[PDB]
């Protein structure tokens, strides 16, 4: 989607806010937000691509100025409601309950060794998105390609700043989960992945740095051949 979240190249966002140092988690709620990532993933709320799409659908004004982990909370709620796992009305009632009683206890529950097992496995083993496909790569290093001008209303990894631009294939990485299908609940449908080099002049015109290039990853359907 052509969401505001796709900020690459956007002007007027202001100076970078960067403290000399900071903690990993600025508040207890952040630790909870973070931990809900593997929790909702394991529960089937969504995959990684869908996770991103939920955030992309946020109110732009809220997205631009809210604490980072709040974006994660928004996507959990989005998918919880989508899958019917979260009842919004009950969530609203509980929110008010905790507003009025911030120190009220959390529900009684049993600890589950399987959840710790999942955490250790996901953290140290990873959640690889690489997949094998039957078709060979359509492109190769050195190929001059043009990025698609398609503008899907659903999830995609097509930054507005690279659309319709011409670049050179830097490397073929093999096949991976395809965002355009995965992020929209349409399955993995793996596609070959390539890193493509775009000159700053190609991306920004005369205002671009005369000695800079941006490397952007493109799934096979995103690009078409110009010069082999």
């Amino acid at each position: 989607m052509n969401g505001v979240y796709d900020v690459g190249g956007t002007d007027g966002l202001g100076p970078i806010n960067r403290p000399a140092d900071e903690p990993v988690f600025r508040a207890e709620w952040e630790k909870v937000a973070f931990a809900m990532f593997p929790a909702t993933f394991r529960a089937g709320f969504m995959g990684l691509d869908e996770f991103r799409f939920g955030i992309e659908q946020m109110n732009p004004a809220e997205y631009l100025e809210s604490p980072y982990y709040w974006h994660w909370i928004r996507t959990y709620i989005h998918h919880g409601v989508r899958t019917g796992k979260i009842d919004l009305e009950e969530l609203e009632r509980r929110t008010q309950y905790y507003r009025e009683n911030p120190d009220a206890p959390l529900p009684e529950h049993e600890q589950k060794p399987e959840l710790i097992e999942f955490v250790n496995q996901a953290v140290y083993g990873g959640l690889p998105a690489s997949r094998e496909v039957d078709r060979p790569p359509k492109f190769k290093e050195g190929d001059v390609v043009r990025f698609s001008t398609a503008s899907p209303k659903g999830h995609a990894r097509r930054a507005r700043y690279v659309r319709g631009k011409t670049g050179t294939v830097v490397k073929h990485h093999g096949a991976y989960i395809y965002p355009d299908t995965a992020g929209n609940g349409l399955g993995e449908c793996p596609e070959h992945l390539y890193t493509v080099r775009f000159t700053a002049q190609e991306l920004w015109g005369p205002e671009g740095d005369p000695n800079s290039s941006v490397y952007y990853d493109c799934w096979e359907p995103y690009i078409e051949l110009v010069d082999t």
Binding site: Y5, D6, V7, G8, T10, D11, L13, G14, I16, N17, R18, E22, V24, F25, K31, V32, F34, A35, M36, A39, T40, A43, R52, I55, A61, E65, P67, Y68, I73, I77, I86, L91, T95, Y98, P102, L106, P107, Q111, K112, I116, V119, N120, V123, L127, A129, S130, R157, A159, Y161, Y176, L193, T195, L203, G208, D209, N211, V214, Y215, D217, C218
Partner: protein, 203 residues
């Protein structure tokens, strides 16, 4: 930046805290989230996984030409030699800074970062200011924000992590470090030097 429509940070934190505790209570009742699972995830990224891991990889590459070749050929496999890898670092591609080229990484679409070697990203990396500007005015951003002046004649390659491939910068080894031990060299490798916003520590 000033926004006359925005509530105070205090009110914002109070609201978020309540909403998170509410959502947490529901996920707990569903049996998919527990207090031990929360504490375990936090423990890992607060004390176990951090930029000290990436520093180990950098110093090994600096002191072992063969490992450096392997690192640049296949980042994931090379890092596995040091027992480093995992979540959000399943596919890593390391890029080498030289006298002719300087690399800098970003996730313009969200906040993608190589967790296995750098831990969780600092807030500025995840914010709109850095993300929007680095692909458009990388030279000015490095100078203005990080006091890092990259000569106009030196090419700046900005790597946007639009896929699961995670880009990591192998900073140049600072001068005057001939024969230093890996431990001594590690003191010069910062999280910033592996993002590309700063060179490794001088001297």
């Amino acid at each position: 930046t000033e926004n006359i429509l925005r509530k105070s940070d205090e009110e914002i934190q109070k609201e978020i805290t309540a909403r998170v505790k509410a959502l947490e209570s529901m996920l707990i009742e569903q049996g998919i989230l527990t207090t031990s699972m929360i504490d375990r995830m936090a423990e890992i990224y607060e004390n176990e996984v951090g930029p000290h891991l990436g520093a180990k990889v950098v110093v090994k590459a600096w002191t072992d030409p063969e490992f450096k070749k392997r690192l640049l050929a296949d980042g994931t496999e090379a890092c596995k030699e040091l027992g480093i890898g995992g979540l959000q670092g399943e596919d890593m591609m390391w890029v080498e800074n030289t006298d002719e080229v300087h690399h800098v990484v970003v996730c313009t679409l969200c906040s993608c970062y190589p967790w296995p070697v750098l831990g969780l990203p600092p807030n500025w990396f995840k914010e709109p200011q850095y993300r929007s500007r680095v692909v458009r005015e990388p030279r000015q951003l490095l100078k203005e924000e990080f006091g890092f002046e990259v000569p106009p004649s030196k090419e700046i390659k900005v790597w946007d992590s639009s896929s699961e491939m995670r880009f990591v910068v192998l900073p140049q080894r600072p001068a005057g470090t001939d024969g230093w031990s890996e431990e001594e060299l590690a003191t010069l490798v910062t999280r910033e030097s592996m993002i590309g916003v700063e060179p490794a520590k001088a001297v």
